[PDB]
Write a protein that holds these residues in place. Sequence first.
Motif, short mmCIF file in Angstrom:
data_model
loop_
_atom_site.label_atom_id
_atom_site.label_comp_id
_atom_site.label_asym_id
_atom_site.label_seq_id
_atom_site.Cartn_x
_atom_site.Cartn_y
_atom_site.Cartn_z
N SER A 114 -29.51 46.85 6.61
CA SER A 114 -29.43 46.38 7.99
C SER A 114 -28.60 47.28 8.87
CB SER A 114 -28.86 44.97 8.04
OG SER A 114 -27.57 44.93 7.46
N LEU A 167 -25.20 40.22 6.88
CA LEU A 167 -26.01 41.42 7.04
C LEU A 167 -26.57 41.86 5.68
CD1 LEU A 167 -23.64 43.47 9.39
CD2 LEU A 167 -25.64 42.20 10.06
N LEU A 198 -31.70 47.68 20.49
CA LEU A 198 -31.40 46.60 19.58
C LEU A 198 -32.36 46.67 18.41
CD1 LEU A 198 -29.67 43.95 19.08
CD2 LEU A 198 -31.42 42.79 20.48
N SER A 199 -31.83 46.89 17.21
CA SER A 199 -32.70 47.04 16.05
C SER A 199 -33.12 45.71 15.45
CB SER A 199 -32.08 47.99 15.01
OG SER A 199 -30.84 47.54 14.56
N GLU A 200 -32.20 44.76 15.35
CA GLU A 200 -32.48 43.46 14.74
C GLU A 200 -31.34 42.49 15.08
OE1 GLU A 200 -34.10 40.89 13.68
OE2 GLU A 200 -35.43 42.09 12.41
N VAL A 201 -31.65 41.21 14.96
CA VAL A 201 -30.69 40.13 15.10
C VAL A 201 -30.78 39.28 13.84
CG1 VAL A 201 -29.94 38.16 16.47
CG2 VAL A 201 -30.85 40.18 17.59
N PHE A 202 -29.72 39.29 13.03
CA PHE A 202 -29.68 38.55 11.79
C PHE A 202 -28.95 37.22 12.02
CE2 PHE A 202 -29.93 43.01 10.69
CZ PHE A 202 -30.96 42.97 9.79
N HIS A 203 -29.46 36.13 11.44
CA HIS A 203 -28.82 34.82 11.54
C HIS A 203 -28.82 34.17 10.17
CE1 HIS A 203 -27.28 31.30 13.60
NE2 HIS A 203 -28.23 30.56 13.06
N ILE A 224 -26.24 31.97 18.19
CA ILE A 224 -27.19 32.96 18.66
C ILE A 224 -27.02 33.25 20.14
CG2 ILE A 224 -29.63 33.50 18.87
CD1 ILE A 224 -29.95 31.67 16.36
N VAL A 264 -22.15 46.49 16.08
CA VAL A 264 -22.65 45.21 15.58
C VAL A 264 -21.88 44.14 16.32
CG1 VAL A 264 -22.97 43.68 13.61
CG2 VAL A 264 -23.27 46.13 13.33
N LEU A 265 -22.62 43.25 17.00
CA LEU A 265 -22.06 42.13 17.75
C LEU A 265 -22.25 40.89 16.96
CD1 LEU A 265 -23.41 43.45 21.06
CD2 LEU A 265 -20.98 43.00 20.75
N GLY A 275 -23.56 32.47 11.04
CA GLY A 275 -23.24 33.78 11.57
C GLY A 275 -24.47 34.40 12.23
N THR A 276 -24.22 35.19 13.26
CA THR A 276 -25.25 35.95 13.91
C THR A 276 -24.74 37.35 14.08
OG1 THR A 276 -25.89 33.98 15.17
CG2 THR A 276 -26.82 36.03 15.87
N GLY A 277 -25.59 38.33 13.81
CA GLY A 277 -25.25 39.72 13.98
C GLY A 277 -26.35 40.48 14.70
N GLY A 278 -26.02 41.04 15.87
CA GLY A 278 -26.93 41.88 16.64
C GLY A 278 -26.59 43.33 16.38
N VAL A 279 -27.56 44.09 15.86
CA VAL A 279 -27.32 45.47 15.48
C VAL A 279 -27.85 46.44 16.53
CG1 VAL A 279 -27.56 47.21 13.71
CG2 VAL A 279 -27.42 44.83 13.03
N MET A 280 -26.93 47.18 17.14
CA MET A 280 -27.24 48.21 18.13
C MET A 280 -27.30 49.55 17.43
SD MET A 280 -27.25 46.18 20.68
CE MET A 280 -27.81 47.42 21.84
N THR A 281 -28.38 50.28 17.65
CA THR A 281 -28.66 51.53 16.95
C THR A 281 -28.83 52.67 17.93
OG1 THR A 281 -29.72 50.30 15.17
CG2 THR A 281 -30.27 52.58 15.29
N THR A 295 -23.92 35.52 20.70
CA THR A 295 -24.16 36.89 20.32
C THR A 295 -25.04 37.57 21.34
OG1 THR A 295 -24.04 36.21 18.01
CG2 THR A 295 -24.91 38.30 18.44
#
Lengths: 14, 357
Positions: B148, B144, B303-308, B34, B156-157, A6-12, B37
């Motif tokens: 996060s 997440l 963009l605050s962070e990209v979690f994998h 990745i 969140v994408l 899984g990948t999650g990009g967090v937009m704030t 996303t």
Amino acid sequence: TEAAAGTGGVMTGR
Amino acid sequence: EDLCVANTLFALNLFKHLAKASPTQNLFLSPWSISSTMAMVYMGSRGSTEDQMAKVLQFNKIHSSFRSLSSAINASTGNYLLESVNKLFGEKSASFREEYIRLCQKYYSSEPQAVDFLECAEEARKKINSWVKTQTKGKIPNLLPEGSVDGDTRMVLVNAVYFKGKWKTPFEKKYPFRVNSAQRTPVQMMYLREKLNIGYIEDLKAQILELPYAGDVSMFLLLPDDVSTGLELLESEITYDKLNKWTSKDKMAEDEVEVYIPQFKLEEHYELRSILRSMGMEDAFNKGRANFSGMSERNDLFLSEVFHQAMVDVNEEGTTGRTGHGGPQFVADHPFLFLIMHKITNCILFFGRFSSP
């Protein structure tokens, strides 16, 4: 093989 | 033409940078997940943010390309389970650009959904994690991590990818694995004697072996001939040109090969902001400078962070009297790189470093 990801990009707001 | 070239170039550069943070321990990721996303994030970027993301992601017709590649990866087969799914979770009180939402659904099938980040962020995190868990058949349960997402989170994408395949030929479950010059660790080996594609990449001083699954997916393994993991040269010199030459459909020569590989399981979690910044994607992560006006006309996002998170479980599962040992051996009793390749698209679905049982 079993594989997963899984990948999650967090937009704030600012 | 290799239709997955940008993604492969990105995959390799990403691996090189991640290895700066983690030079020797086990590594495992899905570059496909990745790239997908980040493609959705790119769709919302503008100005310098956009220009940098295109450079980093190796785009220098992108969205239609992802849709086409995704279709091929998701094609029904009968041979294995393989699914890639995107998802957009958006703050319910936010007003995103209608064209962004429309185009993201068109090209990524992200089924944009509203959630309550503003007041119930922890609930939203749980819901997102549950969605990923379901998509991954329980394998990625908490994408997440705590903290996060919060009341300032706007979107969140997400991409989730899942693969389950059986080897074309089953291994036999048969010992010391050389971790570094001061450590050997016992590992359960799996043995196979079969007609397989094997070669040697002189520029990387490494054997390459292809292990096919049933269907058009394969694992390729790269095994070196330092006092640490033995992978310094291979990792520093690997490039698209050097690798693609050997993973290409008919370069290698099939021969009877005796293979010993470890049975292993990996589970790795990453936070990629530092890595992506180092690769050149700076403005996206800069609260002050980011431009995501493609997502929101107010230009009030960054963009605050990209979690994998990625996992893999390798075992013997597949669909007499020979005594000689004159031919090729591939004995993976020391650190190696490996990748899982979708052969029709030429996309790397998964890439890793196995170094420590």
